[PDB]
Write an enzyme that holds these catalytic residues in place. Structure first.
Site, mmCIF file in Angstrom:
data_model
loop_
_atom_site.group_PDB
_atom_site.id
_atom_site.type_symbol
_atom_site.label_atom_id
_atom_site.label_comp_id
_atom_site.label_asym_id
_atom_site.label_seq_id
_atom_site.Cartn_x
_atom_site.Cartn_y
_atom_site.Cartn_z
ATOM 1 N N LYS A 11 0.855 4.537 9.442
ATOM 2 C CA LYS A 11 0.834 3.146 8.993
ATOM 3 C C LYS A 11 1.423 2.987 7.597
ATOM 4 C CE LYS A 11 -3.652 2.977 9.640
ATOM 5 N NZ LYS A 11 -5.026 2.403 9.525
ATOM 6 N N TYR A 12 1.414 4.047 6.783
ATOM 7 C CA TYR A 12 1.849 3.951 5.393
ATOM 8 C C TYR A 12 3.004 4.878 5.039
ATOM 9 C CZ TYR A 12 -3.021 2.480 5.845
ATOM 10 O OH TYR A 12 -4.213 1.956 6.316
ATOM 11 N N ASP A 63 -3.288 -8.796 17.016
ATOM 12 C CA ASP A 63 -4.205 -8.082 16.118
ATOM 13 C C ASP A 63 -5.457 -8.887 15.837
ATOM 14 O OD1 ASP A 63 -1.336 -7.746 15.182
ATOM 15 O OD2 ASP A 63 -2.343 -5.850 14.646
ATOM 16 N N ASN A 64 -6.598 -8.176 15.763
ATOM 17 C CA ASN A 64 -7.875 -8.715 15.311
ATOM 18 C C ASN A 64 -8.015 -10.192 15.679
ATOM 19 O OD1 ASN A 64 -8.248 -6.185 14.161
ATOM 20 N ND2 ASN A 64 -8.302 -6.910 12.036
ATOM 21 N N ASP A 102 -3.150 -5.710 0.792
ATOM 22 C CA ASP A 102 -1.739 -6.075 0.874
ATOM 23 C C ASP A 102 -1.467 -7.369 1.654
ATOM 24 O OD1 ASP A 102 -2.745 -4.618 3.074
ATOM 25 O OD2 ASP A 102 -0.842 -3.634 3.543
ATOM 26 N N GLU A 128 -6.712 -7.225 20.661
ATOM 27 C CA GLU A 128 -7.250 -6.066 19.933
ATOM 28 C C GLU A 128 -8.501 -6.492 19.153
ATOM 29 O OE1 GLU A 128 -6.124 -5.260 16.153
ATOM 30 O OE2 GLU A 128 -6.992 -3.242 16.101
ATOM 31 N N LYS A 159 0.822 -1.199 0.000
ATOM 32 C CA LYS A 159 0.000 0.000 0.000
ATOM 33 C C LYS A 159 0.863 1.258 0.000
ATOM 34 C CE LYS A 159 -4.388 -1.530 1.785
ATOM 35 N NZ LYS A 159 -5.418 -1.286 2.810
HETATM 36 N N1 Z3D Z 1 -6.422 -4.125 13.459
HETATM 37 C C1 Z3D Z 1 -5.021 -4.519 13.278
HETATM 38 C C2 Z3D Z 1 -4.884 -5.432 12.061
HETATM 39 C C3 Z3D Z 1 -5.095 -4.681 10.731
HETATM 40 C C4 Z3D Z 1 -4.773 -5.671 9.593
HETATM 41 O O1 Z3D Z 1 -3.386 -5.786 9.496
HETATM 42 C C5 Z3D Z 1 -4.203 -3.427 10.597
HETATM 43 O O2 Z3D Z 1 -4.507 -2.740 9.392
HETATM 44 C C6 Z3D Z 1 -3.380 -2.145 8.828
HETATM 45 O O3 Z3D Z 1 -2.559 -3.151 8.160
HETATM 46 C C7 Z3D Z 1 -3.221 -3.724 6.953
HETATM 47 C C8 Z3D Z 1 -2.305 -4.775 6.383
HETATM 48 O O4 Z3D Z 1 -1.007 -4.254 6.122
HETATM 49 C C9 Z3D Z 1 -3.566 -2.607 5.961
HETATM 50 O O5 Z3D Z 1 -4.248 -3.130 4.843
HETATM 51 C C10 Z3D Z 1 -4.437 -1.627 6.630
HETATM 52 O O6 Z3D Z 1 -4.833 -0.552 5.701
HETATM 53 C C11 Z3D Z 1 -3.805 -1.043 7.862
HETATM 54 O O7 Z3D Z 1 -4.755 -0.207 8.549
HETATM 55 C C12 Z3D Z 1 -4.447 -2.508 11.810
HETATM 56 O O8 Z3D Z 1 -3.587 -1.391 11.759
HETATM 57 C C13 Z3D Z 1 -4.132 -3.270 13.108
HETATM 58 O O9 Z3D Z 1 -4.328 -2.430 14.221
HETATM 59 CL CL CL Z 2 -8.450 -2.426 11.683
#
Ligand code: Z3D
Ligand code: CL
Ligand code: Z3D
Ligand code: CL
EC number: 2.4.99.16
Lengths: 649, 649
Positions: A520-521, A380-381, A345, A409, A250
């Site tokens: 993040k990017y 994460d998630n 991604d 999270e 990304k």
């Molecule tokens: N909730 C967790 C897990 C998510 C999934 O990774 C993560 O998302 C980030 O990473 C993704 C993969 O690189 C990107 O596609 C996305 O746009 C970006 O926001 C969250 O930041 C993180 O907090």
């Molecule tokens: Cl998220």
């Protein structure tokens, strides 16, 4: 064999999944054990809690009391000690001494059945003495027996001799309990204090670089640690530190195509350079990571690493273990999603082809970082991976290493959120960022400090890289001050993501909770020294709040919390107590207008009678106030977001 | 092993004492089984209830539905058949067809990956068809497979062939379930219909004598049974039928000394003439009692005998089993009390010197009456005897004779009330007589028809010899009519104590709930012939209500009950349904003034749309109405207590 015992002991709490999972506590944490207890007839019952440590040793005599008249619900407070798996039972019994004393105090003054009632007391005290091992204690009770039986003494003096402090002291050490009935044991998992209490700070090492080398390394990012420790934090949470994929990487602002020097999202884990057990080459080597951990520890900081069970299309797993992914009929893997959000991604992991191999590999990765000093993982998630997968993985890791802390999270529906906590997650992210009005905060904290506290420990991050709430967007710096006070004083664990203290609050667009130009990017260099010189940081307030928490035990626990009424909807008030420490907080939730209110304190909830004064020191300013049951406050945004007071004893 | 399975199934209900005691039902009774069901990720789940009979045979396919959006709480109705110990589980599963259809309905018109979407659909329907027996159903599915694969047709046409009603029909009968995960079984005790449903009538045989012999015998009292059967009752409850003590016998109006002719309280059981296994000589012999039972059975009446575990000072137990009593130091046994009631004419039982002997003697006495055709026992004040004693006794009796019904007369604190039902009492007296306003009735019946119905079956006696409520004292005959309608339609079991139909409502004194000149302490001849002829009895209303219950299955169950709003606090409205049978009741609770109101019916709760009309017949009058979502009513006390309507067609 009957289910119910001689003196019923029913519905012991706390209980989690009917006793199939443990209730939770940490070392030094107090909480209430309760049960429904009663007997047939009208004689008095007593009850007590027996808390047993991992070696089976019982705690002190812990008598319970009826919590509210006519309810038959009884409770007592217990305190957890050393870590490990404990158990608790409730015992109930007939209380013949209390029963007799109540009758005698009524009948003797009226001259009713005097000789009979006094003789009932005498042979009762003889019965209590039968079990007393100490010769002198028995002689004490027998002296009261002889006085009760002394017909050459006035009736009131015969009775009084049964009610002396010396008699009470013997019975307090050897109470006479009839028909003792016990519940079956319930499990309690006691974990280290950090599982409940700590201040967290999240930052991206790659953003702390140099003009010649903009991508930070672990060696350059280590020089951020002195500021973090000086702000009073205990835990440094790092986004993923692994190589980052190139396929579908990304670009800036969550665009789908990375161009040129774009660094991508750290959550797109994996490349030919390595996977979840490897270091991003731009951050350095494993030895550089060890240096970072060492320097952090020297400052009193623990590292929490992100654990994201997912990968980029370039991760070695994709071709080594295709069965860890869902494939379409052309063999391709759909990118992960979390609607309405799309993660183009990365690929999500699939769990039903090789659950054993995935568990083995997950705990191998965790133990690798654990061997390098990482004892906390931000997962994460977790709600997009199977609940029982986490139950297995956490049991595996904590089986050999019970100190490891897992933070879930899971921003999702309540059932999942509660179940993940119940199957082992030490800490949980919460709905905190979406609770901003007085009624929202009061209701949600009432839930978190109530029954949920037997299985969930909240981590109040006032922001994350994915959550910039409209309250902060619209309220500016006075709103950052308010949310910091609230997070730090309502939960024993709170956190911020770097830039919060700079009051960064520009959204990607109106109605979004993303940051513009999100870190993040992209690399996000920040001139920390300049922000401090220009006074545009709330690092001093953050520092002060963490010191207040370190100085006041009431702020290092969760369950004791009471909201006091005020007469303005924008002004909330609450107190927390631990032992002799009481903290009283009044917050103006309005970031734009000064608010005046009368705070009417529930004095007994402060341990005070209604006419007493409440000497307080506002820890934010050092000023002292002479408060009472009703107090006028005036709170001005940008100057006085709140009073954070310690009650003076 | 993990506690959570592949697809989470949590907190299955009904549950009683965490599964250590059975939930309750009767033959033909429907009730809801519920669970918390969800999975990780975004794909759909399904669930179903597996009810197994005592032989382990499963019931029909019983799919569940989510009960409210976003709650992850699912439920389905099951129906118990033959008596015995049953079990139930909830199964949860991934629902791939629902998942695929959701994605296909989006991606096909969007033109996203449509070749892959349609091929995944074809492979999925082939998998669903693999398990479908029946050439017709399997062929229907395989035809949809071939249409999904037919690339000579447009993508939308290929999808549409997978979404036809004939395809849905096969899938509804042979659903494709993945990752099927079961809860552990929970126990269900299914008992005979009379445990839940029946009309009860209480009278004193000794009051039903003759002009020349005022003390009735069983032979003269048998002559009252035809009138009781004619008002539609099913059960006749008799106060104790044993010899009555003379020591401390009570006189008229609960006075402490009896004269020579006074008959005393039947609850003061026992004399040299015999104890709990004997007949009062003025009532006759055991052969006379058998005659009474035989005549009752011919009229369709079952006998319930009073079982009072207590005795007069003259009972044989007092010298044969002194250890069944608590003696004070001078040898005296304090008389029984249920404060503020005092029972100077009886001794209470003590349970801890000889518990086995008491249990043996109790079940001996019960089996004696059981041998003479008594299969129902009304147990006095069970809360003044140990809960575990009743658990043992009931398990003993029902172990050999599962048809025996025990009714707990426990007017006491809620914890004890609930626990007695949970340890085995088939029925319970309730707080009904002290719930008279609309808010009181609505709240209390919401409780009884909700979770409490998994362990308690209410018996709504509108009066008892000990309870003449002020509502009846002040309201006269229109109040008796109101309470009869309410008791008969809100519980599948209700009762009255003889004289209720004559509207006897003179209290002992203002503020008392005792009757003046109470039948407990004196013969009470009543001129039934005169009252019938002069129309001063509500026996015809009682008869009509019992006939309506016998004709309308909705009134023979408890749990299906909904309150509909009205705009007058004196007017309450509610409906009950069982299959296609719907009963709708509107009651004026004011016994003194005519009340008019609008009843606004919750039409979907009746199975109707908001705009439909509902033709109803008022079963009390035969008049027909055409009702809709809002209906004017006018209820004149004395003329009309209520509308008791059935929905037509
Ligand atoms: N909730 C967790 C897990 C998510 C999934 O990774 C993560 O998302 C980030 O990473 C993704 C993969 O690189 C990107 O596609 C996305 O746009 C970006 O926001 C969250 O930041 C993180 O907090
Ligand atoms: Cl998220
Ligand atoms: N609740 C149960 C049990 C009670 C105790 O037996 C019984 O009380 C009656 O019997 C007593 C004993 O003879 C009398 O002393 C008393 O005045 C009279 O009211 C109740 O009627 C009955 O419903
Ligand atoms: Cl009573």
């Amino acid at each position: 064999p009957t289910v119910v015992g001689r003196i019923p002991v029913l519905d012991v709490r706390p209980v989690v999944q009917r006793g199939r999972r443990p209730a939770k506590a940490v070392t030094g944490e107090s909480f209430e054990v309760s049960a429904t207890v009663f007997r047939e007839g009208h004689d008095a019952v007593g009850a007590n809690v027996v808390l047993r440590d991992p070696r089976g040793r019982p705690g002190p005599w812990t008598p319970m009391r009826e919590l509210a008249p006519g309810t038959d619900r009884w409770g007592a407070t217990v305190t957890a000690g050393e870590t490990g798996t404990w158990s608790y039972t409730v015992e109930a019994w007939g209380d013949p001494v209390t029963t007799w004393r109540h009758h005698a105090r009524i009948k003797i003054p009226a001259g009713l059945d005097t000789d009979l009632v006094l003789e009932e007391g005498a042979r009762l005290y003889e019965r209590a003495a039968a079990d007393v091992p100490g010769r002198e204690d028995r002689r004490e009770l027998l002296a009261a027996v002889d006085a009760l039986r002394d017909e050459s003494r006035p009736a009131a003096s015969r009775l009084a001799a049964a009610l002396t402090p010396q008699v009470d002291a013997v019975l307090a050490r050897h109470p006479l309990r009839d028909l003792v009935t016990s519940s079956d044991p319930l499990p309690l998992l006691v974990e280290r204090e950090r599982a409940l209490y700590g201040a967290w700070y999240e930052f991206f090492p790659r953003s702390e670089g140099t003009p010649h080398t903009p991508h930070g390394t672990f060696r350059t990012a280590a020089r951020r640690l002195p500021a973090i420790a000086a702000m009073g934090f205990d835990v440094v949470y790092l986004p993923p530190i692994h190589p980052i994929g190139t396929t579908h990487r990304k670009g800036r602002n969550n665009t789908l195509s990375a161009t040129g020097d774009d660094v991508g999202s750290p959550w797109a884990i994996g490349s030919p350079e390595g996977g979840h057990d490897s270091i991003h080459p731009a951050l350095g080597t494993l030895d550089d990571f060890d240096h970072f951990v060492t320097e952090a520890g020297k400052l009193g900081l623990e590292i929490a690493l992100d654990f994201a069970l997912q990968c980029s299309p370039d991760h070695p797993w994709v071709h080594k273990h295709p069965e860890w992914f869902h494939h379409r009929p052309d063999g391709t893997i759909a990118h992960a999603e979390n609607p309405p959000k799309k993660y183009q991604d990365i690929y999500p992991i699939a769990f039903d082809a090789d659950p054993d191999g995935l568990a083995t590999e997950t705990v191998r990765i965790l133990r690798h970082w654990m061997d390098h000093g990482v004892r906390i993982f931000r997962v994460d998630n977790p709600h997009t991976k199977p609940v029982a997968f986490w139950e297995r993985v956490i049991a595996d890791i904590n089986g050999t290493d019970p100190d490891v802390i897992f933070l879930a999270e899971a921003f999702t529906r309540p059932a999942m959120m509660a179940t993940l906590a119940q199957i082992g997650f030490q800490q949980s992210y919460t709905y905190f960022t979406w609770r901003n009005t007085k009624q929202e905060l009061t209701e949600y904290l009432t839930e978190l400090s109530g029954e949920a506290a037997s299985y969930m420990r909240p981590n109040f991050f006032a922001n994350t890289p994915d959550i910039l709430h409209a309250y902060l967007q619209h309220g500016g710096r006075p709103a950052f001050e308010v949310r910091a006070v609230l997070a730090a004083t309502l939960s024993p664990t709170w956190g911020i993501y770097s830039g919060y203290e700079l009051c960064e609050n520009t959204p990607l667009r109106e109605g979004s909770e993303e940051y513009l130009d999100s870190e993040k990017y992209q690399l996000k260099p920040r001139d920390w020294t300049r922000a401090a010189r220009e006074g545009t940081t709330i690092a001093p307030l953050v520092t002060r709040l963490n010191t207040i928490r370190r100085e006041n035990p009431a702020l290092r626990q969760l369950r004791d919390l009471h909201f006091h009424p005020t007469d303005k909807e924008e002004v909330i008030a609450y107190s927390k107590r631990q032992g002799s420490n009481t903290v009283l907080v009044v917050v103006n939730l309005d970031p734009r207008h000064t608010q005046e209110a009368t705070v009417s304190l529930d004095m007994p909830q402060l341990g005070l009678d209604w006419h007493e004064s409440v000497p307080v020191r506002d820890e934010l300013t050092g000023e002292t106030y002479h408060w009472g049951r009703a107090n006028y406050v005036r709170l001005e945004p940008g100057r006085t977001p709140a009073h954070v007071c310690t009650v003076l004893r």
